[PDB]
Amino acid sequence: MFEPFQILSICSFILSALHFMAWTIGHLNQIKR
Amino acid sequence: MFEPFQILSICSFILSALHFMAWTIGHLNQIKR
Amino acid sequence: MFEPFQILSICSFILSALHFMAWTIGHLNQIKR
Amino acid sequence: MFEPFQILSICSFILSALHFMAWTIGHLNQIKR
Numbered sequence: 045m046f047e048p049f050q051i052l053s054i055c056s057f058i059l060s061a062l063h064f065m066a067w068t069i070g071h072l073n074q075i076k077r
Numbered sequence: 078m079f080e081p082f083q084i085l086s087i088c089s090f091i092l093s094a095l096h097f098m099a100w101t102i103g104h105l106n107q108i109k110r
Numbered sequence: 111m112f113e114p115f116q117i118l119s120i121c122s123f124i125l126s127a128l129h130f131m132a133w134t135i136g137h138l139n140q141i142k143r
Numbered sequence: 144m145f146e147p148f149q150i151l152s153i154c155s156f157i158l159s160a161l162h163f164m165a166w167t168i169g170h171l172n173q174i175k176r
Contacts, residue, residue, distance in 0.1 A: 049151070052082070052086060053151065059093075060158075070104075071169070085115070085119060092126075103137070118148075118152065125159075136170070
């Protein structure tokens with residue numbers, strides 16, 4: 045097909061990459077003991 | 078097809094929009110320093 | 111088909127129902143002022 | 144098919160297993176009263 049796979053597949057793919065990106069940053073915490 | 082895509086697709090779509098809406102609001106916090 | 115839809119569909123369906131159930135309970139908090 | 148199902152299916156499957164694993168551990172807390 046012209047597209048990589050499907051509109052639903054592409055959207056979920058991007059929504060997943062960012063989801064783990066922003067969610068990971070929020071979970072991560074910087075501390076200096 | 079008559080429907081936009083599928084029952085499972087439509088449900089997940091709505092469940093995702095709200096999921097990020099309510100979840101985002103809960104994560105967001107208002108503070109006045 | 112014999113099954114309601116598909117193995118992947120059924121699994122995700124159950125995993126979603128519980129996901130929102132346990133996740134909702136954890137988010138909910140009881141307080142007595 | 145040669146593969147268990149599909150590349151997208153396999154990836155999501157693994158990403159889900161770990162997602163619940165690491166996420167569960169983070170949620171879990173050990174305390175000694």
